[PDB]
Every structure is written in C-alpha cells, then in structure tokens.
Write a protein that binds this ligand. Structure first.
Ligand code: NA
Ligand SMILES: [Zn+2]
Lengths: 418, 278
C-alpha cells in the first residue's frame, strides 16, 4: 500500500512511459510489461499518467491486482493504447476518474477486466477511444459534494459493458452513461440495479449516439419515480432514436395487473404509428361503438409534457350508455421474446386497457392482459412488460371506455420488442 | 499488416472449425489490403462488440464466407461510409465476400455515421441480407415492382443483360425515358422494419436520365412516418454502386424503395437492389 504524503506536489504521482521508441523492440518490450500488486492511496490531488508525446508506445501493459483509490484519476496521454486493467479498483476518485481527451495515437482496445469502480467523484471522459468493461461493477454512488462519476462518451468513442453490474446504492440517483456525437454504447449479459428512490435514468443517448442492450436484467417493474421529468418512464433518456434491445427482461418478473408500476426501455422502440395523435387524425386506430350513444374521439393539446409529442387522443363518453373500443394492431411479434407496452393516460371514465395477440387469421392465441386505468385529473404513465406468446402475428392494443360520463386523454402509446 | 514478401496472415477456418472474435479490433494499416478471415466447409465465425477499421485504399473484403460457412456480426462498428474501393471486383461494395448466404448481422452501425446525401460512398454488409425479391430482374419480369406514370408519353421498363458483373445476377432493370415530358415512379415495398435498428440499402446504377432514388418508411396504413431520404444519381455511362445505411424510424412497417425518372431523354439500368436489417 503506497499512501501519498500530504506534502506531495505536482499533478501526477505516477507516469508510465516507454523510453524505447524503436519499432523492432516495441513488441519484445510490451509483451512482458507488467505492474501488479500495488494499492495507491492518494489525497485527491494527483493523477496517474499513461504515455506521453515524447514516450514510445505504451501498449500491452498489464495492470493487475492494483488499487487506485482516492486519487485524481487516470489520464491517458499520447501513444497509450491496449492497456489491460486486470482486476483493479478505481474508486473514491476526486474531480476525475478516467481522462481520455482524444490523445494522439491512443485509445485502441482499452479493457477493464473485473474492475471495482465505485464512489467516484469525477467523470469517465471518453472523447473518442475504444473501451471495454468486462465483469465490472459501477458506480454504486458518487463522492458527496463532487461531480457525477458519469461514463461520458463523445465524438466517436465506443464502449462495451458486458458480463457486469450497473448498480446504485439506496439514496444515489444520477445518470451513469451519456452518449454524444457519433458515439456508441453496447451493454450485454449484465444487470442494471436501481434503488427504490432512483428518479432519473441510468443512460442518456444524444446526437447520433447508439445504445444497444443485449440479454440484460432490467428494472422494469416496481417504481413510479424512475425517469422523473423525461418523456416517459423509460430506462434510456435523450432524444437519439438509435436504440436497440433484444433478450432483456424484468429482473424478477412483472405483476401484470399493476401497469402503474411499469417502466419501458425506450419510447423509440415503438412500432405503433400515430400513437399520440400527432397526425391530427385517428389513422392506424379504429373506434368501434358498442353502446347506445356514440363515444367521440379527437386529437388535442392536453399532454403531460411535449418532449416528444404535443398532442393526445381524447375519448369522450357523453352518456352512461356510450361505450366503444379504441384499437390499433401492430404486426411485430416474436414468440418467446419480451415486449414493452406503455402509454400516458388521464382517465375520468371507466377505461379498460388491454393487449392480446392474434394470428394471421385474427384468432386470439392466448388470454388477453387487461388493466383498469385509475380515475383522476392527472397524467400518469402505465407500462406492461411480458412475453410474446406462441402463434402471435400481430399485437392488439385496445382501450374500452364505458359506464361513467367523462373521458380519457391518451398520450404516446408505445409497443415494441426488447 | 502482412510481412512483405510472405503469405497473408489470414484466419482460415476449414472443415468444422468455429471462431469467436469479441471485444476487439480488426484493423489494417494504410497501404495494407488482404482478406483477414475465410470460412470454408461447415465452419462458423462470430464477431461481436468489435471495430473493423479499413484504410482509404483497402480494395478487397475482410471476410470471405464459402461453402456451408456461417458469419454472424453482433453490435460491431463497421466501415460502411467513405470508400469507393472496398470489395473491388466483388458482386457489390460489401464487407463479406464469398457465396455462402448464411450471413447474420444485428446491431452493427457505420463507424462515425453516414452522410445520407452521399450514397456513392456507401458500403453494405452483405448482398445476401436482402428481403427484396426480384431486385435485379432475375424473374425476367417486374414482379414485386410497380411502374406508375406521372408525365406525358410512357416510361418503359424491361429486363436485360446490362450488368456490372455476373457474380450474382445476369439481369438488370432498364427504365427508359423517351421524351422530356415523360416521368414515372418504379417502386418496391419490403415488409421488414425494426425501429431503432440500422438497415442497409444498395444497388448498382448506370444513369443517363434524371433519376431520384429514395427510401421512405410507411406504417401499416401507408402513412409515411418520417421524411424520405433521397439521392440524385449522377449521370454517366458507367456502372457504380450506391448504398445507404441508416436507422429505421419509429412506426415503420414497410420500407419503400423508389426510383423516379424524368426530364432527360435517356435511361437507367438498375442492378441487384438490396434492402435488409443489420
Ligand atoms: Na406482414
Ligand atoms: Zn462476451
């Protein structure tokens, strides 16, 4: 354990260089390059530097069984790439955690293997570069009074997060990943664990950014505060529509009668069309009367927020005898795969929302799943995450209004596979 | 790169070998160009969460899939924009060569985006990721296509042998504009859309009229769910490959590939139209 003294000055406590600038010797030297078995305990003022404009290429360096605790971060300089952090701790950092400010001749396959990265007080700045997280855990929480330890991708950076855990402790709530410019984030075979009071989103996708989720355990049931102030109760924020998810599932299941506790992956995984009345008509929907009087439908400007749409459908029940079905079907079904269904609603009549799955001949292939929307004068988000049944060809979203004189505003209807 | 004067350092799978390439980088230095992976027999290659980086004058393909081989790409950064020399002499400007049609790709994307007005700089993953049918006139008719007149006189369409190469099809569509007043749309729609996932669109064209090619996405009721992406095909007397790689928009149910010809007496030969998800 190397504890930095209080009198230590400068910006760096350790700089890793290669005074051999010769090509012939590079592979010979870098094959055996090793730093192992040291815990560095800083005082939050000095960084670790890798490379340098005057250094030879620092690559294929194994940093194994090492700790970088309470430092001012790890900074990549010129000529630093393919560094292997092999089971290391990078925790309790001050001001910065990892600095990659697009240095020259740097960034190829930088891998964190089984790394413990928690309680940091500064961002992971990935301006370009290629970063791999494998069986890592982060962020747990942030250093109180400092900056969010966000993994911030910008320019043309890529980041893989696989076989790991994205978890926040109770009382911790901040964005963990941001994707900007033409950056890309891929998360696979991992768990994302959010405490009950988590009120933002773990991932924000901006610009030309891409986010892809693959066989991940997701917190899609239980919370009514996730993504407070976003377009929907969604796991991925931002306005970039380049969102992909396959094989993801609710962590420990989903109580299908409590759509009020549901969360979707993203509002852009949506094969519904005109799901918020943005066409200023009801194209892709049919309204089938079932009572004595006529239920009416219109498109209005009463919305919970205008982050995606400024319109909503409004179904009106003028008499106790009026009743109707408001229906759209979506040809987008893969049996055995989970789907997401979501919508905002403000209901003052009796509305039964349901989904069922039909085959190519229109036969229902399984029992429908219904949910009575609570009555009230506020918008609330509802979502269902469940598995597509065998034989399904098209999903059918239906709203049945009846019984009570009033109406329901329906905003941003969403259905897609995750 | 390769050792100068020696053999290609190709990763050559034969018989019943398997190979996984994950979390890594497949990159060639400037001035280096050779096939990096070959798949033969009943071998299988899977590439995941990796980058494939090709220099400016790279002129072949990094992967060749032969026989009963399988190649699968998963969430990879691909060089799909910028080069007109990739896969020189192959059936299309494609990243995977060979004749094996067992090609899969999900979650792949152009490395740093795609300037959607420059289809002349586009590259596709594979011509076998194709849900277009009769995309090259191989049926000797225009099944799955519609010709709709929009001007005076009549634009005509035939299938003929005018091709850039015979590696996949020996036929092409030929649209002919007889007068300056003639105009028509030549359209196929493909029900194969996953919102949020990238698509590939590609075709060979040799154009002496005014041809606006475009793709747009329609819902199940035929409404466009986003602005169409159009590309004016350059005029000339040579075949060139054009491609667009972009993201399927929300609400998309069917992709609509359209060629609008008008204005100039002449024609356009269209060869090996390709659309699929990657
Ligand atoms: Na269909
Ligand atoms: Zn893996």
């Amino acid at each position: 354990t190397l504890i930095e003294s209080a009198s230590a000055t400068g910006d760096y406590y350790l700089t890793i260089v290669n005074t051999d600038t010769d090509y012939t010797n590079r592979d010979v030297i870098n094959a055996t390059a090793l730093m192992t078995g040291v815990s560095f305990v800083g005082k939050g003022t000095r960084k670790l530097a890798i490379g340098g404009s005057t250094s030879g290429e620092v690559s294929e360096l194994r940093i194994s069984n090492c700790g970088f605790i309470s430092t001012a971060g790890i900074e990549f300089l010129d000529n630093a790439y393919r560094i292997l952090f092999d089971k290391c701790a990078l925790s309790r950092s001050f001001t910065n955690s990892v600095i990659f400010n697009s240095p020259a001749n740097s960034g190829e396959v930088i891998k964190f293997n089984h790394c413990w990265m928690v309680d940091n007080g500064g961002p992971f700045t990935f301006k370009n570069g290629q970063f791999i997280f494998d069986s890592c855990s982060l962020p747990a929480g942030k250093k109180s009074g400092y900056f969010d330890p966000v993994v911030a991708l910008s320019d043309n950076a890529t980041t893989v997060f696989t076989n790991g855990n994205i978890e926040y402790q109770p009382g911790q709530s901040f964005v963990g990943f941001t994707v900007d410019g033409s950056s890309r984030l891929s998360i696979s075979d991992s768990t994302i664990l959010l405490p009950n009071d988590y009120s933002t989103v773990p991932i924000v996708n901006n610009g030309d950014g891409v986010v892809s989720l693959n066989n991940c355990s997701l917190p899609l049931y239980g919370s009514t505060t996730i993504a407070t102030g976003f377009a929907t109760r969604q796991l991925i924020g931002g306005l970039s529509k380049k969102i992909m998810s396959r094989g993801c599932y609710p962590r420990a299941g989903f109580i299908t009668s409590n759509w009020n506790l549901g969360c979707i992956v993203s509002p852009y995984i949506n094969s519904v069309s005109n799901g918020s009345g943005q066409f200023e008509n009801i194209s892709n929907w049919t309204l089938s009367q079932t009572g004595t009087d006529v239920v009416t439908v219109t498109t209005g400007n009463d919305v919970p927020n205008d982050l995606m749409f400024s319109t909503s459908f409004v179904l009106s029940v003028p008499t106790v005898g009026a009743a109707a079905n408001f229906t759209q079907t979506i040809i987008d079904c893969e049996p055995g795969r989970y789907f997401q269904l979501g919508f905002w609603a403000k209901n003052t009549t009796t509305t039964l929302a349901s989904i069922r799955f039909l085959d190519q001949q229109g036969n229902a292939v399984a029992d429908s799943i219904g949910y009575n929307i609570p009555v009230g004068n506020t918008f609330n988000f509802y979502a269902l995450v469940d598995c597509v049944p065998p034989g399904a060809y098209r999903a059918e979203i239906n709203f049945n209004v009846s019984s009570i004189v009033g109406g329901i505003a329906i905003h941003n209807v969403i259905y897609g596979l995750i």
